[PDB]
Design a protein around this ligand. Structure first.
Ligand code: HEC
Ligand code: HEC
Ligand code: HEC
Ligand SMILES: C[C@H](CCC(=O)O)[C@H]1CC[C@H]2[C@@H]3CC[C@@H]4C[C@H](O)CC[C@]4(C)[C@H]3C[C@H](O)[C@]12C
Length: 71
């Protein structure tokens, strides 16, 4: 399957899966979540534990606005 781009208005956000499969061997951090996670995602999650917060906790991954968002 292909990577996905989140169409944030301030700039597309790429999500590269291969880098996540390799760096986050705890696949249940994202997979096998109960129902609601597709509908639940949005800006609050992305700037929180959905994206940025995990990077902050794992001490690796982009944490600045222009590292995630790129037109
Ligand atoms: C959240 C940060 C995730 C982590 C950690 C892992 N995966 Fe994942 N996976 C996630 C997304 C949003 C998607 C779909 C979008 C995409 O970019 O592909 C996937 C997809 C998969 C698939 C399909 C990949 C493909 O067919 O090319 C598989 C089999 C899957 N993911 C496996 C998987 C494994 C085993 C993980 C841990 C080592 C892993 N993922 C972590 C989000 C995230
Ligand atoms: C932990 C459970 C994570 C979640 C949820 C998300 N990401 Fe992540 N990301 C994680 C790690 C530990 C890393 C390091 C990968 C590396 O080897 O450098 C990253 C990295 C990225 C990258 C940069 C990838 C690269 O090859 O340099 C990007 C662009 C990225 N992550 C984006 C991203 C977004 C948009 C997320 C939510 C949709 C997301 N990450 C979730 C750990 C975790
Ligand atoms: C990657 C880990 C991110 C970092 C660092 C920042 N943002 Fe972000 N933001 C991210 C995602 C995945 C999303 C899309 C959410 C979704 O609904 O899919 C966003 C969203 C925003 C938005 C809202 C855009 C819209 O609703 O169309 C804005 C205005 C935004 N982000 C701004 C922003 C700024 C200024 C940041 C630095 C302070 C920043 N983001 C960091 C992913 C990431
Ligand atoms: C559930 C995990 C981890 C965050 C958390 O614990 O909530 C998060 C991390 C990244 C999230 C995905 C980002 C890309 C997609 C954003 C869409 O708008 C909703 C579906 C997708 C496929 C999201 C589904 C789910 O919300 C995920 C896989």
């Amino acid at each position: 399957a292909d990577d996905i781009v989140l169409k944030a208005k301030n700039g597309d956000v790429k999500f590269p899966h291969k880098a996540h499969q390799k760096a986050v061997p705890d696949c249940k951090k994202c997979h096998e979540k109960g129902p609601g996670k597709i509908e639940g995602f949005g800006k609050e999650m992305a700037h929180g534990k959905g994206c940025k917060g995990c990077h902050e906790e794992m001490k690796k991954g982009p944490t600045k606005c222009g590292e995630c968002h790129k037109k």
